[PDB]
Symmetry: C2
Subunit: 421 residues, 2 copies
């Protein structure tokens, strides 16, 4: 194909040839791990030299079904030969059914399909504001949305305006007003913020992903929802990274028996094949988006809908939530037993399901040394906040692969501690 023919013509043999190409032509907004991946299958990837690795990032939980899941790729191909895009300006024979499928799977009246996670977040903020002005009847332009320090939901200007991460907002203002930032995992702070009747919504992650896999105290989300409901404030739960079986339940909110007023999904919703995200909620909230008040060229395109239905079905068929629960408990147990005490620079081992992290002390060790040693041992991952090592493999990882990977991971921390001496 054209990409293959063009690449051949470039005579890119070595990993360095590729690194140089990326440095010259690609916007330099990433500091990638130095590997050149050419193929993915399941929990494994291979570089251009045939070296194999376990992918322990999985698209930050976009690849829960593994790389190139056969069923998802067959669903993609089948629909792609037929029809890929109509616009929501015209009806089609896939969008409605796919929305019904999601509505029933998650228990919501209405499904808004967008492309990216950031778009789902923006759309939920628009819904929450418009609902607050039209249904709660709060004063024009006074709507407030409460979010948490260290939250991450995207890179639009409005997301930058609601971030507390320096690099995410610095020099990108002026900023969108209307946000109240409170500490994460702090019910007392939320209770206080909720005293303001201009609050439209509280927007939160069940586990802060980019913030460093921050697992809140028992009852947090349950308590939060009761406080919000008490004040007629919408609970917007972002499950883009925590949802779809990654934490051992269909939704991470299920850990607290919470049904979000507005749910956000994305990432694994497409098994990492094409960008698709969703915003779901009750009729009286979602219906505020009247014709012409919101839209998207590719949102709900038939190709993405066909992929999403397949991707969601794979989660249920392969019992990936039970897999994540079982393997994750094992991973944490092994790491805590074999690394705590032996490795003094490990601050904490935490997570739920297969959303796990190892926070290291960056004053006691170079975290990049851990990253490189892991790769040397066949494990590929990328930390968040420099010091929080992340272990987010595809959920389809086999028992043997997971055992092999756990062993490699443990060996890597140990080799960095021995090298410290």
């Amino acid at each position: 194909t054209n990409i293959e023919a063009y690449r051949d013509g470039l005579k890119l043999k070595t990993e360095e040839d590729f690194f140089a190409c990326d440095r010259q032509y690609v916007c330099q907004n990433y500091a990638p791990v130095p590997v050149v991946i050419s193929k993915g299958k399941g929990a494994r990837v291979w570089d251009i030299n045939g070296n194999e690795y376990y992918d322990f990032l999985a698209g930050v939980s976009s690849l829960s079904q593994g790389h190139c899941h056969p069923r998802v790729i067959a669903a993609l191909c089948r629909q792609a030969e037929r029809l890929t895009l109509t616009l929501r300006a015209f009806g089609n024979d896939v969008t409605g059914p796919a929305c019904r499928f999601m509505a029933e799977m998650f228990g919501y009246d209405r499904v808004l399909l967008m492309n990216t996670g950031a778009e789902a977040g923006e759309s939920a903020l628009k819904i929450a504001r418009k609902w607050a002005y039209e249904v709660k009847e709060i004063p024009p332009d006074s709507a407030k949305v409460i979010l948490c320090n260290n939250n991450y939901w995207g890179r639009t200007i409005t997301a930058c305006s609601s971030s507390t991460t320096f690099d995410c907002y610095n020099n990108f203002g002026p900023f969108t007003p209307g946000f109240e930032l409170i500490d994460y995992d702090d019910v007392g702070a939320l209770e206080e913020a909720l005293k303001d009747p201009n609050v439209a919504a509280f927007f939160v992650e069940p586990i802060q992903g980019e913030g460093g896999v921050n697992v809140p105290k028992p009852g947090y989300l349950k308590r939060a929802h009761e406080l919000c409901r008490s004040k007629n404030v919408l609970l917007i739960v972002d499950e883009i990274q925590t949802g779809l079986c990654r934490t051992g339940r269909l939704l991470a909110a299920d850990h607290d028996e919470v049904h979000p007023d507005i749910l956000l999904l994305g990432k694994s919703l497409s098994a990492g094949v094409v960008p698709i995200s969703a915003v779901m909620g009750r009729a009286d909230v979602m219906d505020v988006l009247k014709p012409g008040t919101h839209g998207s060229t590719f949102g709900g395109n038939p190709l993405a809908c066909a992929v999403a239905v397949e991707a969601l079905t794979v989660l249920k068929d392969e019992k990936l939530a039970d897999r994540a629960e079982r393997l994750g408990a094992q991973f944490r147990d092994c790491l805590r037993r074999e690394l705590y005490g032996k490795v003094p620079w490990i601050k904490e081992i935490r997570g739920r399901g297969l959303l796990n992290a190892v926070e290291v002390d960056s004053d006691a060790i170079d975290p990049n040394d851990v990253v490189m040693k892991l790769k040397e041992n066949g494990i590929l991952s990328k930390p968040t906040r420099g010091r929080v090592m992340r272990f987010i493999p595809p959920l389809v990882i086999t028992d043997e692969e997971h055992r092999d990977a756990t062993t490699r991971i443990i060996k890597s921390f140990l080799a960095v501690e021995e090298e410290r001496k």
Copy 2:
């Protein structure tokens, strides 16, 4: 062997178009007022409904389907790459993203390529780049950056895009808004010159032809004059070619009509031939390099599947000489509609466009716009107006000579029939 969507849909027993309309009303967020047609397949310039009725698609994803529905080369490239690798994230290298960026950098003449997913993301990204550049290179005061745009502009649905829109339904009840935008009339060099006196302006963000605003073609020299004014004040010219680029107007970029090379170029829509959402922001090194590691990202932006598709989609544009095709057919389209409709149909305000980005604006007082839309559908033409009264004719560029002659006759027939029935 049925895939899940197929089996699930079969279980719903949806036989008529009305069964589908009802499913959509119940479960799909009702933010669209769709045309009553249920499309099941598309090939080239044609689509077919669930009952096998053929239609010409004259919206083409608002120029997302320039290469036609399901272009076989593009679908083949998708299927090939999808069996190999679809997503790595930019946290890891791969054997596709760099090459695809180089391919684009060379085709459009830019140092660096930022790949995102949607058009709105491209525009957001560009605004962030312009702001950051203004703060760091122009050294304007903190939080004082301004961006000039035009009334009736359309670039997205994010809160920041709403904050810079003059369309009521786009911004109403979605505030409070992102500050930092100065709105001026489109196609008004004097208004731009005045707005450029503010030294805190970082950029002027403009479409070479306003798309959602009504296929508003500016006067001769507009974009060229704009660029000179922007250069004079060290203000970046951000040109949005998401709808106008990629051969739609008869040239690779609509900016080529004025020999303007945008400081920052935005592409999207037909960049993927309508197969998967991919968009691009391109610019010179000292502008794009303000996005340092960790200051911007995207999960799917630059994914290998989208990159393979894009390179095939762009190659189709060149190989099939679609810019020439657009130029030739589009000139014939406006010529035929003017010769057969001006005078004979009095409620037509103007027939305008460039290449195959054409519109027929009607006087919504003298006629009900929707009667034209329905008559067009009766005659096998699917279209969607903008601003109610602006009829749009945006077919895939791959439409054959025979298909285009046929379609033009059907459109003219539809306008005259609404007139006879008037």
